[PDB]
Amino acid sequence: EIDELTALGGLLHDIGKPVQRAGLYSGDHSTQGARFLRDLAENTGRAEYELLSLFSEFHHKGHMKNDELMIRRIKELSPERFGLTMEDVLNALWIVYEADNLASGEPQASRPLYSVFNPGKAYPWAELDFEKELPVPGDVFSIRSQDYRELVKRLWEELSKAKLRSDRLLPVLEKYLTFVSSVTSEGNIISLYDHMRMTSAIALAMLRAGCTAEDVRSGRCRKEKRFLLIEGDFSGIQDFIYRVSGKGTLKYLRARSAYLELIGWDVVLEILSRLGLTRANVVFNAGGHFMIIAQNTPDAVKELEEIRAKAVEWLYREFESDLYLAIEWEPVSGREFGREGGKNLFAEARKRLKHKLTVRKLKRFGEIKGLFEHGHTERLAECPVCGRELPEGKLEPSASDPETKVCPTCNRLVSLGGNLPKLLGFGRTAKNDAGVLVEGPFSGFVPYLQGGRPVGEQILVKNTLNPGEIPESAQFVPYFVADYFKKDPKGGVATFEELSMASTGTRRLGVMKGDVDRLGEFFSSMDSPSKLATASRFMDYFFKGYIGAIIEGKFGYIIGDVPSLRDWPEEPDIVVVYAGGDDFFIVGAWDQIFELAFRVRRAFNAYTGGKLTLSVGLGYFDERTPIYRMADVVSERLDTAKDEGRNRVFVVGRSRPLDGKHKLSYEWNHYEELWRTYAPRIYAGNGRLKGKLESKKGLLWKLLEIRELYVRDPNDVRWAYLTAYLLGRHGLSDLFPELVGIDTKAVERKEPQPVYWVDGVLKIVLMAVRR
Amino acid sequence: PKFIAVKLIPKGPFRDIPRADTLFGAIGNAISAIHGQSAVEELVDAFVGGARISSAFPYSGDTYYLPKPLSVEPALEGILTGLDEEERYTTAKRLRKAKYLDLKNFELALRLRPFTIPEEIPYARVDVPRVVLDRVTQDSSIYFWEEIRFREKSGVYFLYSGPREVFDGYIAPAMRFLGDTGIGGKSTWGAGLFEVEFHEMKIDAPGSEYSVTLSNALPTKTPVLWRLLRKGGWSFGRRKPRMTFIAEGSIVKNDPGGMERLELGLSHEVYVYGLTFPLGVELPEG
Amino acid sequence: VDASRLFGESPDVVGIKKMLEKGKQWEAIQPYFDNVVREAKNFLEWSPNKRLANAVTVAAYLTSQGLILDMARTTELKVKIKDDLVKMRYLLAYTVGKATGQSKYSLDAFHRILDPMLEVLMGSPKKENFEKFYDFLQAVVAYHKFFGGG
Amino acid sequence: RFYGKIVIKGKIKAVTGLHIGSQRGIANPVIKDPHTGLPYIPGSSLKGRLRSLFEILVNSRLGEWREKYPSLANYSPGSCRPDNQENCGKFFNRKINRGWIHVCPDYETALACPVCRLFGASGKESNFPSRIIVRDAFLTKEWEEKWRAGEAITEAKIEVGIDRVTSQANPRTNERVVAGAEFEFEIIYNVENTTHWRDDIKNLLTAMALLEDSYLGGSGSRGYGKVKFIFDSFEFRPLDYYRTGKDEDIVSIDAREKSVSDILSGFDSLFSEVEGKL
Amino acid sequence: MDRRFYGKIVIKGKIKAVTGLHIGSQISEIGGIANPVIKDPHTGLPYIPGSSLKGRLRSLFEILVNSRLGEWREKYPSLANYSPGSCRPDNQENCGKFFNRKINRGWIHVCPDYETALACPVCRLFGASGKESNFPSRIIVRDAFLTKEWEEKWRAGEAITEAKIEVGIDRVTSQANPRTNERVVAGAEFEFEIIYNVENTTHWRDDIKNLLTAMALLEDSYLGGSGSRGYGKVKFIFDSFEFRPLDYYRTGKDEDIVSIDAREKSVSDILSGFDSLFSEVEGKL
RNA sequence: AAAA
RNA sequence: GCAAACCGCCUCUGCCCGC
RNA sequence: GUGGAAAGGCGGGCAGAGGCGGUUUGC
């Protein structure tokens, strides 16, 4: 079929680039990809690899000269055996050629992939495994031919055992082409997988648009609106996942974050199948926000207007104006994908669509038509957990305590929360099947457990790129998730009470919520869709894959010495609620939530090139604090760290004067310098103080009482000699020698005194002793 | 236009900032206490035709706050064209998250001018913990409870438009009754109590076809730009069903809203306040 | 050196704790400061860090030697004093009229500073101008424990 | 129905130092204003202490008050904590969570109770609303000016725990308001029925007079209460006041009178003009 | 179960400091008398807390009940659950020894239940706590300030406290170690307030006589202080027992029975004829 | 809500 | 003829249990 | 015709245990 042939032609068009950086054959990599695919058609492969070598030998406009050698070479092969029309095969070659120029707009060296965050730094080649190795950009711009040779051998082995389909090839190509540069140039920051993936996306969107070979020969697909950028966003997530009472356990939350993502995958996989697209047409899908390149046909605009209509009406019946999916699309052209002259047309069409998302979000449920219409229904009640309104009788008893009458969509997520340690993924099947726990707007999802057989046309498999036990007629869709949890004596997820028991000194539950700063400005600097793809996967893969290996105690030669209260355990009592896109929400024992906030930041500082920052809000809570309470404090603390300044952490609650010149949150390098000077002279390790300070909390708490005189009047100088008298009487005059005199340089800079910033170091040490 | 501004100088903490449907339910309960049943039905007819009250908004020392219109977020790139781009992004972010504006910046945001947000909010939301004690054994049972604590010279106010004899016969006797009893929440703990003062507010509004609502709306037709508000209260022990209102600051066009009567199984009919409080606004091309 | 460490407003309380804890180096700059404290006969003219400036340079001088307070504390409780400032100047004269031996010089320097500020307190109100003095008198004893004295 | 609002004003004197905790630099803090940092007496802490003192008062006189107050014949003295069944024959019938409180379960029953008529009832399907409002008591203007002038309004009192054999000391700290402080209270009674308002004002003043010999908040058994009521004025605020606003309400002046003298003597004598307009 | 009310027996009088009294304390303080005494923050004068008096009366009464766990058990049940001693050598909370709670590291007899503390002579008078039950106290001991004639001696200029210098002398080299102790002057006189809350008319003789037993033990022992060095020597000077019945609160009239012992001793009330002083209390019950 |  | 040397605190404990 | 009605942040807890204003010799 020409549908599978145009997509797999553009996906494998750049094949042989990694055999020319290796050097198995003679030069001019278009010759080698013809030979690498001819040999691949010989052993452990079908005969369609023989005809896919036509796509790797007639591109870049170097051998496809004068329209005569393309006819003879295709004539030698049998199109009829494949069943593809002889003319129709030729039509596909031109489409693949055009989509290569629309995806890059761009030698002779084995030069590595450079980082999208620092274009001056480069990645060494690794696999995409997320296990024991962190891809950190370094100044080593050299690649050994043997390393490339090893990659080709692994790639040859996996392409021979892999079915010839777009879904099967895409995880094979992603495993080895993620850290390979596409075009060899200084400061090339586009992955080879992303370029190949975006080329199968555009070539299949051109085929659905109906443009033929002479439309490319005359340049008609270019400078005419034939493409269509789809973009969606879920709105109201904080009020959807975290608006739950004290009847919601940690397992219920961790199932709410898994259920929002299955709503998101149900909409994205509906668009691809109903328009004829593959999974390569998805540019990114990260954080309840996706982007798809499709075709601009009247059949597709009619067909996307039903996916938007049905999914919003499904969300309004289920969740009464708590979660909304705004889907918009903007018609673009071939010249709009790239930078034309000196003007960025891809960042302008993206922000022509981002304004359409903005007005859609202010017309929040306008596609309902019974939205502002009143209808009298008797005997309505509320769920004790999430607090939705249902007619009573639809309420059913909860499995924890059958006295309470919860709504039925919360018992599907208590029962899902017990399966998430046992779960290998999901299967996308029809609404009315056996085994379906939860429904989306278009489908139902059967859990695929450890020992079992998956059922459905699409199988969503989590945290791997290898289709092991999967039927060969089903579609493989990989998805990644940050799924670290502290396991109990059973094989389940620990509770809030079980994590807080493990905390050092005072028993409190630590909650952190942090995200990347000014990320949306960084994505506007991308001028091509193969560059937006690379900047979005690497940013997503940090929070999907590499934030769970920071918790495993790795990467310590990069992280080094962070502010810690105890030594880092082998199994940390950390539960990740969510981590993906540019944000993360993590609960645990308060000693390790404190340490991991400086441990994630130090590794994110080196995962990027030092060019992107974080802001993290920290909170320390009682066990019986409801999670709608625990998520509204730490979100308030994240926004206080963000509005004040970027790249600063909110360590602990503090009292500060109302002059507008004091602020509650610490810069990362500021607090991590205050821990190097104030903590080793008062704190010994693992919950105990130093010598000559044991049982001297009559020094440390009173030092915070002298600090409260500074908070009442910052210009009164009483606090200065009360510290020197308190230090002097106890004989500890050498501990803290700069809190006794006023800093005259801080008065001229209009910055606070050193007694103001000692609060967030002492308080943490006073909670690590039993408080 | 010219409005009567009914200030509420608090004598404690509030439960929530009042809305126009719980202000009309408080007034209709106040009129039934001091006049009778047939004056509430005369009250609803006064509101249905002509004059309607708005929602309650904070003030802090002669600076009367008003909700930000929703007309600015589609325009908010064009409002800030005269700025350096690296500080134009964090000025834009806090201009979109902001909920209230001054009386000076509300009149500029109605005309798509460059405007500024207030820095400090006149109130705070605390969680004060109460407890239940057994009368023999003193066994404690902590629950939590949230309030609105106002500053030294701050408080809340709403606006009135209409004829004067409806104000001076119904609204002005109601707020003197409703000062000693409460507006919402645990008023037996002394929460919703206040002292009342009547003042005069003038608002510059451009003459246009579109208008922002300063109250909850309950629209008869679909509005232009909106934000969904989903509340349903309580009436003499009977739970009200939740209704889809429209938050303050949303844009309608020739839409009067309307009060909806409920049944609820009482001796009388219960009205939910759903009238609009239009002030003219200027829109972009969408 | 000694005048470079004990500068105008607040230079080094931790640097003055190295020299004082050496003999005659502080005995000139602080004697100039005690003369400046004698030039600070007007007590309520220093609302700046000058009270904290002088009391470090007072206590850095008295650290080189050995070195009423509860009467100052009880008259501080009377705020919530002309009859007792006579007795307070009497008990301060009683101490320098008693201390003979190696501690005459520390007590005479302690006599040199307070009685110029105890003359203004005679002809002045009592809520103000004594609160500004009793903040200074606490600050002298506070740093004197810090430098290693008692 | 509505007839008026009897308004009680005066001052709360903390004769011994007062504690009402928050459990959030002193280790146990008294609760304070979020904006100005001043302590206050909650309206719930004063209301629930007046109810608790009066529910024990009515529990002792269940047999003697069967005829003045009906639906005290539906209760037997005691608590429902032993037999874990709500609204049984005992007097403390409702378990809110872990504590047992007398709350009558119906409108027609709580209308004849002495406690739930004055203080309110929950019930199923019924919901009798209370008749009194107990405001938050904030500091007087004389004690706000002492706070501006540098005085301290809360201390930190250190207690200890001592072994009876070895005498090891185990000390803790409690913030408590300085003894002698003045708060400004306010109680608004809602005259719904013109027949029984004399009993409701007298039953309220009885709980005030039990409170002056008991304690408020705090530890109290170690001397953290010792509260004292100093009355100022008793306004009546009739129904004609709320209609027109012309200030001709009834004012009963008790500038220096105790709670025992007020209830003991007076009321008919003080409340003579109040009983005239009913 | 069934907490009632009958009245509030009020014990007023004076606390005579026959010997110097030191109740210690421990912040914007630079030069003062070391080891100070507790003082009212508003009036400046010292006082005796209700915590330091009720805890000192409970401690002297627990040790008296611990001495006789076979002579009080026939009148007080649930004392058969206790063996004389402490729970210190085996660190379990509730075992068969008498002092059965860990405060932080010390051991104090506090009964663990409502039905246990209802029949104990210590915890039905002083109260208890625990996992559930929480039997609350029946006496309330208030903070004792100066009398109004020692308020005025302070106005006249006399000293209400003093400073006593004591020296810990090394036994080998005769080398000193001086320190100053503030102590309220001997002869000073504090006005106290002890209210007993009559909850059961059956046993109120037994709680008043046990409260007067604890007072009689305190006049032989010391209050506060370092009393083995002669710092306590307290003495109770009673002004009036009063009864305050339940009908006092409703009526507001002087219906309270006044026992007159203005010139009697703490061991003279508990002395033979106690029945004669508290006879009119039985006429109102 | 800086794409949760 | 009358004093002058040092010693000016030492060392333990410092929030629990429940909701 | 009020997201309302009902609800004490408190039960129990000594700032306490040991300590001679004292010794030695001269200027």
Ligand SMILES: *P(=O)(O)OC[C@H]1O[C@@H](n2cnc3c(=O)[nH]c(N)nc32)[C@H](O)[C@@H]1O
């Ligand atoms: P209990 O059996 O815990 O009843 C549950 C009920 O009480 C609250 N609760 C109990 N203990 C605590 C605590 O220490 N802290 C907080 N914040 N809440 C507590 C639960 O929240 C629940 O409402």
Ligand SMILES: [Zn+2]
């Ligand atoms: Zn639910």
Ligand SMILES: [Zn+2]
């Ligand atoms: Zn009742």
Ligand SMILES: [Zn+2]
């Ligand atoms: Zn006992």
